[PDB]
Symmetry: C7
Subunit: 30 residues, 7 copies
């Protein structure tokens, strides 16, 4: 369904955000 697909897009975008936050943590402690 279109609605379920769009919710999965939201999840994927948040997994992007998480990756970016993990990079901030690594850049900080370095």
């Amino acid at each position: 369904g279109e609605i379920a697909k769009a919710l999965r897009e939201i999840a994927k975008a948040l997994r992007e955000c998480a990756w970016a936050h993990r990079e901030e943590a690594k850049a900080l402690r370095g």
Copy 2:
């Protein structure tokens, strides 16, 4: 659908958020 379109807009906005965080992680290094 209007609801699905709006959910995709939320996703797009979160992808903008992730890009911003990736830039923060880059800035934090140098």
Copy 3:
């Protein structure tokens, strides 16, 4: 619809967040 409008308000608020996060990165460099 009222639900779709509210979801668009959520999207807009997140675009505000992204602009702010961008300004944080600029302030860092």
Copy 4:
């Protein structure tokens, strides 16, 4: 509707989030 109203509550909270992030950006300078 109560669902639309709750979704608007979520957007309002995210606009709070953005305001605070804009304050972080100002503080980093």
Copy 5:
């Protein structure tokens, strides 16, 4: 309804996040 109640819990959690971001900004000053 259960769905509206859960959405409000989501907003409540984001207000917590906003309060934490205001605190981070405060620490940065």
Copy 6:
């Protein structure tokens, strides 16, 4: 219902996020 349960999971994950942001704030100062 499963949708309400999943929304409550999102709320709980955001409360996790808020706790972590509070830990960042603390670590800052």
Copy 7:
């Protein structure tokens, strides 16, 4: 259901964000 499953994927991604933030906090302290 597909919608419920997608919503749980959003929650999973946010728990990923939380883990990353807990790592950022550990890095700020050292």
